[PDB]
Amino acid sequence: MQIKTKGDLVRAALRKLGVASDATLTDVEPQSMQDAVDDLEAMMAEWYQDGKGIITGYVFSDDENPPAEGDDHGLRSSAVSAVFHNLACRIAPDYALEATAKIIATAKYGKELLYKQTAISRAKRAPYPSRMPTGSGNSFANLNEWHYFPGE
Amino acid sequence: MQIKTKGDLVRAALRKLGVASDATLTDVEPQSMQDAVDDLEAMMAEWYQDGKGIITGYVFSDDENPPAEGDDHGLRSSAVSAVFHNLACRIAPDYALEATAKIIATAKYGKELLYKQTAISRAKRAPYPSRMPTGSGNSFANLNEWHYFPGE
Amino acid sequence: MQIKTKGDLVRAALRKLGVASDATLTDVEPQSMQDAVDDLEAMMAEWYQDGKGIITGYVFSDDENPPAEGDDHGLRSSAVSAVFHNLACRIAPDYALEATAKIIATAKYGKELLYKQTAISRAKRAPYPSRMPTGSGNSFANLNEWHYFPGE
Amino acid sequence: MQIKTKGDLVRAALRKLGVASDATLTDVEPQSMQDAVDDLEAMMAEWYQDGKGIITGYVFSDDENPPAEGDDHGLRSSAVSAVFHNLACRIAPDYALEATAKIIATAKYGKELLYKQTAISRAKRAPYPSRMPTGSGNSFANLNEWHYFPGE
Amino acid sequence: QRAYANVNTSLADAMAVNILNVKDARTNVFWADDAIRIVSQPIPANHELFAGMK
Q: What is the 3-state secondary structure (H, E, C) of E1-31?
A: CHHHCCCCCCCCCCCCCCCCCCCCCCCCCCC
CB contact under 8 A, C22 and D34: yes
Query: Which string of DSSP letters, residue by residue, matches C119-138?
Result: HHHH--PPPPPTT-B--THH
- How far apart are the C-alpha atoms of D16 and D111, rounded to whole Å? 17
Look at the alpha carbons of A132, A137, A140, A143 in this order and tell me if their dihedral is positive or negative. positive
Q: Searching chain C, which residue's CA lies closest to the CA of residue D47?
A: C78
Helical (H) or strand (E) element with C98: none
Interface test with B, best of C27, C49, C52 (most B CBs within 10 A): C49
| Residue-level length of chain D | 152
Please count the residues of chain A: 152
d(CA D58, CA D42): 12
Axis-axis angle for helices D31-47, D6-17 (nearest 10): 100
Residue pair B26/B94 in contact (Cβ under 8 Å)? The answer is: no
Are the C-beta atoms of C53 and B112 separated by less than 8 Å? no
Cβ <8 Å between C144 and E42: yes
One-letter amino acid at B18 equals G
Closest residue, chain B, to A97 (C-alpha): B96
- Resolution for this experimental structure (Å): 3.2
DSSP D92: G
Taking alpha carbons only, the member of A73, A14, A80 closest to residue A45 is A73
Distance of CA D28 to the CA centre of its chain: 25
Beta strands in chain D (DSSP E): none
Identify the DSSP state of C52. S
Alpha carbon of residue A12 to chain centroid = 17
Shortest Cα–Cα distance, B91 to chain C (Å): 15
List own/partner pairs for D111-116 with CB under 8 A and 24 or more apart. Answer: D111/D54, D111/D82, D111/D86, D113/D78, D113/D82, D114/D54, D114/D56, D114/D79, D114/D82, D115/D54
Rounded-to-10 torsion of CA C80, C86, C87, C91: 160
Give which of C114, C107, C15 is closest to D37, Cα–Cα.
C15
Using CA atoms of D15, D21, D27, D33 in order, give the dihedral in degrees to the nearest 10: 20
> Using a CB cutoff of 8 Å and minimum separation of 24, what contacts does A21-29 make?
A21/B31, A21/B35, A21/B94, A22/B31, A22/B34, A22/B35, A23/B29, A23/B31, A23/B32, A23/B35
Residue C129: which residues within 8 A CB-CB, separation 6 or more?
C149, C151
CA distance B17 to B99: 7
The Cα B33–Cα B43 span in angstroms is: 15
**Contacts (Cβ under 8 Å, ≥6 apart) of C124:** none
Q: Of C40, C96, C92, nearest to C71 (Cα)?
A: C40
- C-beta atoms of C1 and D89 within 8 A: no
User: In angstroms, what is the C-alpha Rg of chain B?
Assistant: 23
Partners for A (CB, 8 Å, 3+ pairs)?
B
The end-to-end CA distance of chain D, in Å, is 44
Cα D20 to Cα D13: distance, rounded to the nearest angstrom: 9
**Shortest Cα–Cα distance, C108 to chain D (Å):** 13
At residue D7, the 3 state secondary structure works out as: helix
Contact D103, D85 (CB under 8 A): yes
Cβ contact C36:D75 at 8 Å: no
Q: Which residues of B have a CB under 8 Å from any CB of C? A: 1-3, 12, 15-18, 21-24, 76-78, 80-82, 84, 100-103, 106, 110, 113, 116-117
CA distances from C11 to C3, C18, C47, D41, D94 (A): 9, 10, 21, 16, 12
CB B11 within 8 A of CB A50: no
Q: How many CB atoms lie within 10 A of CB C143?
A: 10
> Residue A21 and residue B46: Cβ atoms within 8 Å?
no
DSSP B93-111: GGGT----HHHHHHHHHHH
**D95 contacts C100? CB cut-off 8 A:** no
Closest residue of chain C to B120, computed from CA coordinates: C52
> Which contiguous run of DSSP H or E holds residue A127?
none
**In this complex, does chain E touch chain C, defined as having at least 3 beta-carbon pairs under 8 Å apart?**
yes
* Interface contact A16-B94, CB threshold 8 A: yes
- After which residues does chain E have a break in its backbone, defined as C to next N over 2.5 Å? none
Q: Which of C140, C142, C144 to mutate to test the interface with E (most CBs of E within 10 A)?
A: C142
Distance CA(C7)–CA(B150), nearest Å, equals 61
Q: Is the dihedral of CA B4, B8, B10, B12 positive or negative?
A: negative
Task: Residue A118: list chain B partners with CB under 8 A.
Answer: none
Neighbours of D14 (CB within 10 A): 23
Q: Which residues contact D1 (CB under 8 A, 6 or more apart)?
A: D77, D80
Residue A58, C-beta contacts closer than 8 angstroms, at least 6 positions apart? A44, A48, A73, A74, A75, A83
Cα–Cα nearest to D10, from D67, D129, D76, D91: D91
Alpha carbon D119 to its chain's center = 13
Cross-chain residue pair C48–B78, CB shorter than 8 Å: yes
CB-based contacts of C63: which residues, under 8 Å, 6+ apart?
A: none
Question: Between chains, do C38 and B101 touch, taking CB under 8 Å as contact?
Answer: no
What do you get for the CA distance between the two ends of chain C, in Å?
45
Burial class (CB in 10 A: 0-12, 13-18, 19+), A6: buried
Say yes or no for a CB contact (<8 Å) between C144 and E47: no
CB-closest option in C28, C38, C45 to B78: C45
Q: Cβ contact (<8 Å) for D41 and C12? A: no
